[PDB]
Amino acid sequence: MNVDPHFDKFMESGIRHVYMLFENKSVESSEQFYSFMRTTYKNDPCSSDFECIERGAEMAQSYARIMNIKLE
Amino acid sequence: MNVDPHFDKFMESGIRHVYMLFENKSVESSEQFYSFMRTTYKNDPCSSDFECIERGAEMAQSYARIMNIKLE
Amino acid sequence: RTARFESVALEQLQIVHISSEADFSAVYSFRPKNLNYFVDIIAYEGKLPSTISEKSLGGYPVDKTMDEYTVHLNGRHYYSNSKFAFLPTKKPTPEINYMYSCPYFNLDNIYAGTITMYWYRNDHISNDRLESICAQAARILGRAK
Amino acid sequence: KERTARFESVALEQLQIVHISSEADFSAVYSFRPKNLNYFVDIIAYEGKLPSTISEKSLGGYPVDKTMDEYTVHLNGRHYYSNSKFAFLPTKKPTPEINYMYSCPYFNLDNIYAGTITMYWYRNDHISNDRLESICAQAARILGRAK
Numbered sequence: 001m002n003v004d005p006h007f008d009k010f011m012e013s014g015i016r017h018v019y020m021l022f023e024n025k026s027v028e029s030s031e032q033f034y035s036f037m038r039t040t041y042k043n044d045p046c047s048s049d050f051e052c053i054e055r056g057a058e059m060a061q062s063y064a065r066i067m068n069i070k071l072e
Numbered sequence: 073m074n075v076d077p078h079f080d081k082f083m084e085s086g087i088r089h090v091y092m093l094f095e096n097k098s099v100e101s102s103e104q105f106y107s108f109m110r111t112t113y114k115n116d117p118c119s120s121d122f123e124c125i126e127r128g129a130e131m132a133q134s135y136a137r138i139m140n141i142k143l144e
Numbered sequence: 145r146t147a148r149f150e151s152v153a154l155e156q157l158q159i160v161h162i163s164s165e166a167d168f169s170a171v172y173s174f175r176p177k178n179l180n181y182f183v184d185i186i187a188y189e190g191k192l193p194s195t196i197s198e199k200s201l202g203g204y205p206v207d208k209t210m211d212e213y214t215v216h217l218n219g220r221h222y223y224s225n226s227k228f229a230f231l232p233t234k235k236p237t238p239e240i241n242y243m244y245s246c247p248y249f250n251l252d253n254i255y256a257g258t259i260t261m262y263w264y265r266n267d268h269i270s271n272d273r274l275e276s277i278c279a280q281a282a283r284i285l286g287r288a289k
Numbered sequence: 290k291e292r293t294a295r296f297e298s299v300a301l302e303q304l305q306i307v308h309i310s311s312e313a314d315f316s317a318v319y320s321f322r323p324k325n326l327n328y329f330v331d332i333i334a335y336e337g338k339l340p341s342t343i344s345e346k347s348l349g350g351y352p353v354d355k356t357m358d359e360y361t362v363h364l365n366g367r368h369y370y371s372n373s374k375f376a377f378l379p380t381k382k383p384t385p386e387i388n389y390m391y392s393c394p395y396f397n398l399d400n401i402y403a404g405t406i407t408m409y410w411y412r413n414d415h416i417s418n419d420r421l422e423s424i425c426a427q428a429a430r431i432l433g434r435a436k
Contacts, residue, residue: 001074001178002327002402005366011181015205025232030175030182030203038400042434047426049366074180075326076249076286077219083253083328087352092381102322102329102350110253114287119279178325178401252325 006052007041013056018064021071029069036063079113081124086132095142108135149173152288153187156281157259161189163277164244164269166261168193171285172230173257180206180213180255183230193262195237204232216247217255221275230258241266246278248285259285292436293320293333299435301334303428304406308336311391311424312416313408315340318432319377320404327353327402330377340409342384351379363394364402368422377405388413393425395432406432 014037022029040059046052064071073080083106091097091105112131118124136143153171161169168190174180185201206213210229212222223244228237245260259281261274268274300318308316315337321327332348353360357376359369370391375384392407406428408421415421 001180002325002364003179004396004400004402005364007396007400008179015181020205020234024200025203025205026200027175027182027184027202030205034176034181041400042398045430045433074178074217074255076247076253076255077217079249079253087328092352096347097350097352097379098347099322099331099349102352106323106326106328110251113253114251117283117286176399178399252323254325 006046006048007038009049009052010041010046010056010059011037013053014060014063017057018060018071023070023072032067033060033063076117078118078120078124079110081121082113082118082128083109085125085128086135089129090132090136090143093143094136095144101141104139105132105135149285149288150186153285156284157187157189160259160261160277160281164261164274166190166268167264168262170260170262171257172260174206174255177250177256178252178254180208182206183232183257185232190262193231193237193239193264195233195235195239196231199233201232204230206230212245212258216245216258219247221246221278223271223274230260239264242268244268244271244274244278246275246282248282250286251289257285296320296432296435297333300432303431304334304336307406307408307424307428311408311421313391314338314411315409317407317409318404319407321353321402324397324403325399325401327355329353330379330404332379333404337409338411340378340384340386340411342380342382342386343378346379348379351377353377359392359405363392363405368393368418368425370418377407386411389415391415391418391421391425393422393429395429397433398436404432 019033046055086109094101118127157169157171170185170188172183173186175182182203183206207229212229215222228243240262242263243260245258247255247258250256259278304316304318317332317335319330320333322329330351330353354376358374359376362369372389375390378384387409389410390407392405394402394405397403406425
C-alpha cells in the first residue's frame with residue numbers, strides 16, 4: 001500500500017507484540033486500539049525504523065493497562 | 073500498493089499511452105478521465121496483464137476521441 | 145454506517161457455497177479501509193470448523209506476509225491444504241483438507257477482503273469451476289461496496 | 290468536500306514558513322489524487338519564482354510516475370533530494386535551470402501518502418540538508434493533521 005512507513009512500523013509492532021496476545025479480539029476492540037494507536041502516533045510521530053518498532057510496542061503495552069485488557 | 077492489480081495495469085496503460093498526451097491537463101480533466109476508466113473497468117474488468125495493458129489504451133484513446141481532447 | 149455490502153455479501157456467498165458444494169464458506173472483510181490491519185468474517189455458510197466455533201470471528205490481525213495476501217495482490221486465486229491466513233485463530237485446523245479463495249476489490253479498486261470456500265472432505269469440484277464461481281461473485285462484491 | 294479548501298489554508302500557512310526559512314527560490318505543496326490511489330499530482334500552492342518549464346500552463350492534473358525514485362523513497366520513509374530528477378514538477382521536459390530540489394512526504398489522517406512539500410533552488414548554494422530536514426519535517430507533521 002501507500003502507507004506512512006513509520007505509522008505502519010509503529011502499528012505493526014503494536015499488533016505483533018501486544019494486540020495478538022489479546023484474548024478477546026472483536027470488531028470494536030480492534031477499532032478502539034486502532035483509534036488509540038492512530039491518535040497517539042499523529043500527535044507525536046516516531047521518526048525512524050528503530051524508533052517506531054519500539055514506541056509501537058510500549059504504547060500498545062500502555063493501552064493494555066489503561067483500558068485494562070486481558071492478555072496471554 | 074494494495075490496488076486491484078488488473079485495474080492498475082489498465083489505468084496506467086491509458087495514462088502512459090493517451091492521457092500523458094492531453095494538451096490541457098487539469099484537476100477536472102483528470103477527474104473525468106479516472107471516473108470514465110473506473111466505470112468502464114468495474115462494469116467489465118479485464119483479467120490479464122496483456123489484456124489490461126491493451127484495453128486500457130484503447131478505451132483511453134476512445135474517451136479522448138469521444139470528448140474531443142487535443143493530443144500531441 | 146452504510147451496511148448494504150453485507151446484504152450483497154450474503155446473497156453471493158449463498159450462491160458460492162451451494163454452487164461449489166463446499167462444507168463451509170465465508171466472506172472476509174478488511175479494516176480499516178486500505179490498511180488491512182484486521183480481518184473479520186461478515187458472513188459464513190455451512191458449519192464452522194472446530195477451531196473457530198464458539199469464538200469471536202472479528203478483529204483478527206492480518207499477517208500481510210502470508211502467501212494468500214501476496215498472491216491476491218498479484219491478482220490470482222489461492223488454494224492450500226494447511227495454510228489459512230485469515231481464519232480467525234492461531235491454532236492449526238487440520239480438519240480442513242482444502243481451501244480456495246479469491247480477493248474482491250471495492251469501488252476505489254483496493255484489496256478489501258476475500259470470498260473463501262472450505263472442505264472437510266478431501267473431495268471437491270474442479271478448481272476451474274471454483275474459479276468462475278469465485279470470480280463472478282468477486283465482481284459483484286466489488287461493485288457493491 | 291471543502292475539506293480540501295481548509296487543507297489549502299493550512300498548506301498556504303506552512304508553505305510560507307518553509308519557503309522563507311529554507312531560503313529556497315521556489316517552494317510547492319503537491320497533493321495526490323484520488324485518495325489512496327495517487328494517479329495525479331497537483332500544485333495546490335507555491336511560493337517564489339515559477340521555473341520557465343511550468344509557467345503559463347496548468348499546474349493541476351499531472352500524472353504520477355510511481356517508478357521514479359522520489360515516490361518510492363518517500364514510501365520507504367526518507368526525504369528526497371536531487372539536482373536533476375523532479376518526479377512531480379508538472380512537466381515532461383527537463384528543467385536544467387534548477388540546481389537542487391529537496392522534498393519530504395506528508396501523509397493524511399488515514400496514514401496514506403497524500404503529497405509532498407518541496408523546495409527548489411536556482412543557485413547552487415543551499416542551506417545544509419540537515420536544516421532543511423527539520424524545516425521540512427515540522428511542516429510535514431502539521432499538514433498530516435490538516436486532513
